[model samples]
Target: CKTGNGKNYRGTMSKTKNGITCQKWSSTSPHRPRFSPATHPSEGLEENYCRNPDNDPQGPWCYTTDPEKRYDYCDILEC
Candidate 1:
């Protein structure tokens, strides 16, 4: 199992628990984020995969494709 912050999840789950498609880490179209491929520095910010670039306690999260909602945690296993 990984830590609560999910800093170690690299499994590449691309959808949120709510079934929202993850946005590309390289794009800034719908919702611009502080976390980025350049800023996070290889913290699995690839190909819209779920990531925890800033140690968010809710675990691995991603910028959603839905522009209104922004971002949310993924359904990745913690155990």
Candidate 2:
């Protein structure tokens, strides 16, 4: 029922002791919007873009430090 208008967004993941952190200027949506590897004002691996989910008001990027975790087409999730 929910649909996106096809917008391009950028994100970055910093290497941490536990895992990588894809940080941004705003919060992440509960929809768990996929990330894109495109470059923006910042230069690095871009993850899910700017989305505001009603459930998660903070909208922080989903955190999954698992190394084995596999994603669909990288481009589908990333811009």
Candidate 3:
């Protein structure tokens, strides 16, 4: 579960005056990992906040930059 963590669940969830949204990352193990439903009306970021980055330099480090440019829908199953 640790290697492929955060995949079993929605990974991230957010709420706003309008409603709530959930996010799931695309590439759980390697390269340019990304979170789902990348945009939330109220919550600027996801609940898990890029969980299970595997100490990946780019994965977790990307959080510091602009959230929009940081997100992606990586290759399927690689997650």
Candidate 4:
């Protein structure tokens, strides 16, 4: 099903929309994110998987592996 903001999406897409590799949510390297496994275990933030723990209108996103970029929305088809 199509999900808005991807609140329940657990997609394993590790690449950002801009073609940058997504940083693992468990790591603090490159960029530090608001969500973490310890904080939001059920948010499905795994293996750089694209998630929407924040329920943003832009949908699921993850921190970029690149140190310069912070984060960006990911491309997910459906839940």
Candidate 5:
């Protein structure tokens, strides 16, 4: 059996009308990516909301107004 390098990531979340916005911070990985609450770019509360067409509790996924052009996070299975 192979040994495992189990790593648990710590993060923060905020509530939105559509879905929760998750910010994962700490990691066991060497890269150790981090984000600043004030400086990091994101759609503000008003524009950040997304539509859950499938009604899965696992989302507040990004929705697109245009049928052809898709947002970075838009997924066919999720939308």
Candidate 6:
């Protein structure tokens, strides 16, 4: 997802010369959002949660917390 400033999070999983790696790029190309590990919780700007923001200035969004069907991610918004 795109951020308010047009910047984004780009992640990738691949086998590199050293080993497999899961990388995230937030200020360049292939914009996408990355989530923290399940063991961690969103506490501040350095951390994030996998849920839609409660108050997004962009507009109304949608969600389904049916337990059986739910998809979420960590994102950033400027406004």
TM-score of 1: 0.63
Please give, for residues 1-79, the per-residue lDDT of candidate 2 as tens digits. 1123224333213222223442332223422233434443322233432222222322223333333332121212233
Candidate 5 residue-wise lDDT, 32-62, digit = tens: 1222223223322122333232233443333
Off by more than 4 A, model 5:
1-45, 51-54, 69-79
Which structure among the candidates has the greatest lDDT?
1
After superposition, which runs of candidate 4 have C-alpha atoms over 4 Å from their true positions? 1-11, 38-42
| Ten residues in sequence with the least summed lDDT for candidate 6 | 11-20
> Per-residue alpha-carbon lDDT of model 1 for 1-79, expressed as tens digits?
2344436443336666455677776566656454655455237666676766656655577776566756776666663
Tens-place lDDT per residue, model 4, 1-79, is 2254435433436766544677777566645564755344236566676765656655567776566776776655563
- TM-score per candidate, chains pooled: 0.63, 0.21, 0.18, 0.62, 0.20, 0.17
TM-score-sorted candidate list, best first: 1, 4, 2, 5, 3, 6
Model 6, residue pairs in steric clash: 9-32
**Candidate 3 Cα deviation (angstroms), residue 10:** 16
Regions more than 4 Å wrong, model 6: 5-62, 74-79
TM-score of 5: 0.20
List all candidate RMSDs to the true structure. Answer: 3.6, 13.2, 13.4, 3.9, 15.4, 15.3
| Candidate models: Cα lDDT each | 0.60, 0.28, 0.30, 0.59, 0.26, 0.25
Tens-digit lDDT track of model 3 for 1-79: 1124345322223211112221333333332235434332212234334333433322211131233343432221223
Best by TM-score: 1
Q: Which of 3 and 4 is the better model by lDDT?
A: 4
The stretch of ten residues in a row with the least summed lDDT in candidate 3 is 13-22
